Structures are given as structure tokens and as C-alpha cells.
Amino acid sequence: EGHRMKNAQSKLSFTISHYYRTRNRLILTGTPLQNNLPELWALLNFVLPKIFNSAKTFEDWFNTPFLTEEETLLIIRRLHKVLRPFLLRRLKKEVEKDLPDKVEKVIKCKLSGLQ
Amino acid sequence: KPHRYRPGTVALREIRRYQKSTELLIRKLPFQRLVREIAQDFKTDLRFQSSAVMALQEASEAYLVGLFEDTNLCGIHAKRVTIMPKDIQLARRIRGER
Amino acid sequence: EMLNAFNAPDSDYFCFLLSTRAGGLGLNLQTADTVIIFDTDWNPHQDLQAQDRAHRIGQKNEVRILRLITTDSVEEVILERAMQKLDIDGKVIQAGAELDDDELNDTLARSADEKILFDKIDKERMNQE
Amino acid sequence: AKRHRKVLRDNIQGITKPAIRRLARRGGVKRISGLIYEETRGVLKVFLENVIRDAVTYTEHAKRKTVTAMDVVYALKRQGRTLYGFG
Amino acid sequence: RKESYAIYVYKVLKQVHPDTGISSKAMSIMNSFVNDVFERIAGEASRLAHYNKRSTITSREIQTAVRLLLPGELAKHAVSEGTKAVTKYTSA
Amino acid sequence: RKESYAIYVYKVLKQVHPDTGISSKAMSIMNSFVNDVFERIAGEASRLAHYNKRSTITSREIQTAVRLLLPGELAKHAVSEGTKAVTKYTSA
Amino acid sequence: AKAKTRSSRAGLQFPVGRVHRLLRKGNYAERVGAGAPVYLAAVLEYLTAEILELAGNAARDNKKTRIIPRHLQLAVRNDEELNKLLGRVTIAQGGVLPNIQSVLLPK
DNA sequence: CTGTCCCCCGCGTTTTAACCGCCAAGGGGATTACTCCCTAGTCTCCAGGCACGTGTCAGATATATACATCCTGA
DNA sequence: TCAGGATGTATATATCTGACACGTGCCTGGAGACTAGGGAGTAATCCCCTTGGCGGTTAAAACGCGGGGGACAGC
Ligand SMILES: [Mg+2]
């Protein structure tokens, strides 16, 4: 649940760096971090204390969420290419295709007189 | 039977202990809530610097401790070792706080 | 205890209450069935986690979920901000009237049979005076 | 309780019996009657009302919404209780 | 020559208890009273200007100084009176 | 920039107990101490000059203010020290 | 060039002009706002008037038609807020309030 | 100085809220730029206020007289 | 508990004065008119610090409970 790592500023993250000799680390998460982008960087930096130059380097380095195919596909393609050996991700659809349905639905309701 | 100290032995230990040390004696979060509530009666939606609260507590404890010092003295004057509301009220009345 | 009890095939209870922040992650449950969201989510990922607690490898039954949003309110506002936040998921993926009972029953139906069950219930709701 | 917490007591009750006792110990009080605890709370409440009122008055004057340490200091200074260490 | 508030105090007295007079000792007391209040308010207004890194004492500073000087109702009414005086003054 | 007397207090400490250091908390206390004293002396000197209908604060007023502020021997030494310092200053 | 005093403009009984000068001569600040001495003079009047009212009442109670220091003392010491305001003030020839403790009085 | 009783203290057990860490939004405390208008400064005029005389009556002081108040024999 | 008496307090009546109220002439300090310039108001940014809630532990607060020491009433 490395998602929790989020912001490297945290005490958790801090004390982990003070675990010193840990010759090989691995992060498990069900999802990539917050949409800002630095969080993704922070985790990537945490995992591999090499991937850096600025905490928010991704805002420029992979300036897709911050032209069409050009700024999107090509940049996110290279995002993938550099993260290709670091992120492993497969979808349940890709893996099984056995989930009974899309299992989705939302509803809306009115307030009571008091509410 | 288990060991029990004569009443007052522990009291003196506490007195020595608390006079020797310097930390705050009132739980900080309870203190903050008290402050914030009081503040609402003069103006709502106020914020406090955390240091502002600390300033209030340093002063508040200093005040109450000083009060207890004088209160204690009054009890002694009346040949008692137990402080009573009458002693607090007197002390403030003599100081001119009421 | 509770987790084992959830796993128990003969569970006396059929439902349970969970903390988004805590229970949203803490559950392996292939016998999970339906999920109802009340808390709403400033960070959509937590709902994705909570939501998908109900269907992991080994999940046998069709999962249904609900999100209870009030009409014309702050919940809609927060919800839409959450919907905006989901865009980054798309970036990663590409890199690599509202109270009509019949309608509600339709959205909750697995079979018209449940609609029928509710019909009886609403008739009971009517029967109560 | 379980069904309803019902744990709302009072902010003045946040000053506990042992908290007061501790203050008294620093003061040098050997023995404390049971009515002291309530009396002490009353006194403190008043003290804070006066200081806070002055502090927020300075805050209002300056057209700000956050009461600062200096505002508290000024309040205390106004009342003849100069506090060192907070600038 | 030496100025005082004797005649102003006197006029005020006449506006409250027309028939009542006032001894010279009582008057000297009232004179020193006025000076005392004047100084307390002015003193607070002064440091208010310093606290806000300003340099002009206006009715805002004085108003605040009053709120930081007079107790309870005295403050409430003094502020009310000050407000009215300035209001009329600038209105006409 | 937020000027203070930290460096001066520090230097003084090293001229009295050269090996002794000082915590930053204690330093802020000393800083506020200096400000307090400064204000008290200056404040008295201010109204002192005012009492004599004078517009200039000189070393005479500061001296008197010290005599009217500090207690006992403390005052005597402060006065002695100030006198000496000024003497040297005007010489140089 | 019709002249009209600021006190009369404000409708006050205190010398707004004098007050203004005093604020400047007392060096309370670098600048003194035009509405400052007006506001202040009003306050000075307010407080003055309230005391005089009470003093006059004291005089009436003692069947006097002239306010003396004793009356001023009685006025200030009886009113709660004025007592607080002037809590550190000694009024010459005022005396003290009539007050004997019940513990000293006979049973 | 003495008796007595009650109530505060010492202490074991149990419950609970403070402390610390985390997470998220966001909104007031700062900055800077620009402008404008409010007040310092100055000169001229004039009456509001001050010192000084001057009358007169409000309260101080005698002066005789009627009632409250405290102490005691009853 | 009640009446007598001695003292004290209070109360009407002169009467007497000196301290306060009031009139007058002067003069300087306050008002008017005018000008400059810089302090304060005001808008726009930004970002750091505050706040609200939750998770999780654990020292501390609460609570009961016996019992001895002090508070206190009496003399
Ligand atoms: Mg996991």
C-alpha cells in the first residue's frame, strides 16, 4: 500500500531513509498517486533516488496534463518508456476478463424537509 | 498489607518535582479548546497562531501558579494547610483583582 | 475476528460498516456483493480502492455499487472535482425524478424478481396505515 | 455510549482536577480542599476572557483575522503582565 | 497664562444639572481627571500606530484606544458618542 | 530583515563567560529583555523632557531616567557605566 | 470668511481645536487625523458628563447645591465602571465610602 | 487545648482522550505597484478664552430644642 | 424581654462671610484659504500556515474505596 508514501516530506518517508542499509526495495500499490504529478515523482524518487532534478520536474519533463497527439501521446509514450522498467501494471480485464460485469452505478436523492 | 506512605509524603515529593521542572502542566489541546471558545464571544471566525496559544498558556499558568502561591500563604496565615475557596477569594481581594 | 466472520459462509449478518480511510484498503473479500458509498471522495483513488475491495481474484458474484449524492448540493460539487481528478488516471492508462422507485429498482435489479420483492415491500409500506 | 457517544462535556472541564493539582504543587500547596477545583476554573476563565478580549481587540484594529503571538503579548503587556520570550 | 478645562467642565455641568454649582477644589479634580483620560487614550492610540507601523492617529486608533481603555458600558457609550460627533462633524 | 540584539547579547556573553553558550530560546528572552528596558528608559526620558517643556532628550535625561528606573546599586552602576562610556565617546 | 469653530461644528462642549493641538504637541504620532481630536473630544465630554451627573446626584442626596470633592468620591466609588476606570486614583479630599464589616458589628 | 467526624489522600483498576502522524483544501498574511487626497506648513484675521474686579448667597457656625440609642435595674 | 436616664444626635433659626458666579477688556491662539507630497488605500498574486478530521498508541484521567489526619466546635 505504497500509495500511502505519497509525499516524501512525511515522517514515514523520512524515517524510512533513516533505515539505512536496505539493499533492495519494492513498492506495491493499486494506483498511481495524485494528479498534481510531484507525488508520482516523490514515489519514483523514493523507489529510485536517481530519478530527479526538481520535485516538480514532471510539470515540464512530462508536460502533458501541465498540441494534440504531440504533447499527449509522444510525451506519455516517453513517460512510459522511462518508467517501463520501473512500473509494472496490468488490468483485471487484461488478466482475467472474468469480472461478472462493469459493476457500476450511482444514484441521486432529494433532501428531507429538515435537511 | 502493601506499603503506603504517610499522607503528605507524596505531596512534598510532587511539590519538589513540579517546582524543579519547567514544563507546562495543562494539557495543550484542552487548553486550546478553552481559548477558542472564549474567543468566539468577542468575534467569530478567528484564527490563532500556534505560538499565540502558547503565549496564552505560558501567561495563564504563570498566573494561576502565582495565585496558588498567595492562596497557600493565606491558608497558612489562618493556621491551615488545606487551601480553601475563601483563601483564593481573599488573595484576589487583597491583590485588587476583585 | 470480523474479517474471519465476513469469510464465514453462514454469516448471520449480511452487511457491515467500514471506514473509507481504514476499511477501504483492509479487506480481502471474494464473497463481497454490493457496495454503498456515503462518504464521497476528495481523492477518487480512495473510492477506487474501496469500490474494488468487492471484486478481487476469486470474486464469484456480480458486484453492484451505489453512490448516494444529494440533489443540488455540495456533494455534487465535490463529486465533480473528483471527476476532474480522474483525468490523470487516463494519462497513466494511455501511457501504458431521481427518486422514482421503479427506476431505482431497475438500477438495482439483477432480475425483475427483486423489483417484485420491493413491490411487495412498498405494498407493505402502504399497508402500514 | 455505543449508540450515541454523548461525550460533550465542556471546554472549561478540559482543565482537569489533576491539572489544577499540578499547578498548585508548583505553587507550593500541600493540601487542597475539594472546592478549589471549581473555584480555580472560574478564576482561569475570567483571566483568559480579559486577555483574549484585549488580544482580539488588537487583531480587529489591525484588520486581521489571525490573532498573533504579538497580539497576545500586547494584551498581557497592557495588563501589567509582560511576557518574555515571544518577541 | 495657564489653560485648563474649567470652563468646559462647567458648561457640561450646566447641561446636566443647571442648578448645581461646583467648588474650586472639585473643579481642579475634574481638570486633572480630564487630563488623565486624555493622556491614557492618547497614549494607547500612540502605541497602536506603532504596533501597526503607521504614523497617523485617526478616529480609528482613538476608537480602539477607547475600547482598550474604558470598561463595559463606558466603552460602548463613549464609542457611540464619538461616532456621532464625527459623523455630524463631517456631514456638516 | 528582522533585526534584533541577538548578536550583541551573544558578544556580551562571550566577554563574561567566554565558554558558556546560550540556547536560542534563552536568546529570544534576552532579546525581549533588551527591548523592554530600552522602552522603559526611553519612555521615562520622553516624558521627563516633556515635564520640563524641553524638546530634546540628552544624556542628562537618559541618566535621570535610569535613576528613576533601576533600583539601588544597580542604578548606581548603570549610571557610572553610562557616564564613563559617554566620556570616552566624546573624547574619541 | 464666516468663522465657525470645530467644536461648534461637531456640536461638542470641549475645545476640539485645543485637543488637536495637544495631540500634536504631545508627539503621540507623526500625523494627527482631522477626525481624531473630534472623536476624542467627544469621548472626553462623555466621560466628564457622566461623572458630573453622578456627582450632582450625590450633592442632591446630601442636600447640597454645589459639588465638592466628597461628592466626586462618592460618585466614582459607587459606580462600578467608573470605579474600575479610576481604580488607581486617589481623589484629594474624597474620603472613603461608609462601610463597616458585619463581623465587627454586634449580633 | 481537646474530641470527633468527615473528607481528602494514597492506591489499584479501568477507560479515554491527548499526542503524534497523516491528508486535504484553501484563505488570509504577507508582498509589490500605483495613485490620490489628507494633512503639514504658512500667512492672515478676530473672537474665545483668560486675568481681573466685583457682588451676593450657600454653607459654615453658633444656639436652643426635640428625639434616637445604648446601658441597666427590673 | 421593658422603662428611665444619660448621652448623643439631629433639627430649626440667625448670621456672616468668603468663595463662587458673573461682567469686562485684551490678545494670542484658533479658524480660513491655499499649496505640496508622501503616507495610506486599494488592487492583484502567491503561498505558507491554519483548520477540520481520522488512525493508532499509551500515558494519564477517572473512579471507587478505605482510613487516618486535619478542620472545626467547644471551653
Ligand atoms: Mg496491499
Residues in B 5-24 whose C-beta is less than 7 A from nucleic strand I are 6-8
Q: What are the structural domain ranges in chain G?
A: 1-107
- C-alpha distances in angstroms, F27 versus C26, D87, F1, G90? 50, 10, 18, 41
Contact D50, B32 (CB under 8 A): no
Q: What is the structure's resolution, reported in angstroms to one decimal?
A: 3.9
Closest residue in C to A93 (Cα) is C57
Cβ contacts of G26 within 8 Å, gap of 6 or more: E39, E42, F50
For residue E89, list chain G residues with Cβ-Cβ distance below 8 A.
6, 9-11, 35, 38
Which residues of D fall within a CB distance of 8 Å from B41?
49
C-alpha B31/C-alpha C104 separation (Å) is 50
- Report the candidate in B56, B23, D73, B21 with the shortest Cα–Cα distance to residue F29: D73
- How many beta-carbon pairs below 8 A join chains D and F? 14
C-alpha cell at E87: 459623523
Residue linked to cell 431505482: C104
Say whether D15 and B34 touch across the interface (CB within 8 A).
yes
Write the CB contacts of F74 (distance below 8 Å, at least 6 apart in sequence): none
Report the neighbours of E using a cutoff of 3 or more CB pairs below 8 angstroms: D, G
Judged by CB atoms closer than 8 Å, whether chains meet at D74 and E51 is answered as yes
| B80 C-alpha to ligand 1 centroid (Å) | 66
In the chain, the amino acid numbered B3 is H
Write out the H or E segment, with its range, that includes residue C35.
Answer: strand C34-37
Residue in A31, A73, A105 nearest the CB of C66 = A105
Q: Which amino acid is at A12?
A: L
Phi, psi of F52 (to 5 degrees): -95, 15
Task: State the Cα–Cα distance between residues E83 and A103, nearest whole angstrom.
Answer: 68
Residue G44: which H helix or E strand, with range? helix G36-61
- What span, in angstroms and rounded, lies between the C-alpha atoms of E1 and D67? 48
What was the experiment behind these coordinates?
cryo-EM
Shortest Cα–Cα distance, F27 to chain D (Å):
8
Yes or no: say if F10 and F27 are a contact pair by the CB < 8 Å rule: yes
Residue G29 near residue E56 (C-beta atoms within 8 A): yes
Q: Which residue has the cell 502493601?
A: B2
- Helical segments of chain E, H only: 6-16, 24-51, 59-67, 72-91
Helix (H) or strand (E) holding D32: strand D31-32
**Contact, F34 vs F9, CB < 8 A?**
yes
Give Dmax (Cα) for chain E. 49
Q: SS3 for B54?
A: helix
Find out whether G81 and E74 touch, Cβ atoms under 8 Å.
yes
Residue A73 carries which DSSP code?
I
* Chain C neighbours, 3+ Cβ pairs < 8 A: A
Q: For residue D69, what is the enclosing H or E element?
A: helix D69-78
Choose among D43, C62, D2, C66: nearest CA to B85: D43
Rounded CA-CA distance C54/C31 in Å is 8
**Neighbouring residues of E14: CB distance < 8 A, sequence distance ≥ 6:** none
CB distance D78–E68 less than 8 Å?
yes
State the Cα–Cα distance between residues F81 and F87, nearest whole angstrom. 10
Distance, Å, F24 CA → H6 C1': 52
Instruction: For residue B14, give the nearest of D14, D19, D25 by CB distance.
Output: D25
C-beta within 7 A of nucleic chain I, residues 11-50 of G: 15-18, 20-21, 30-31
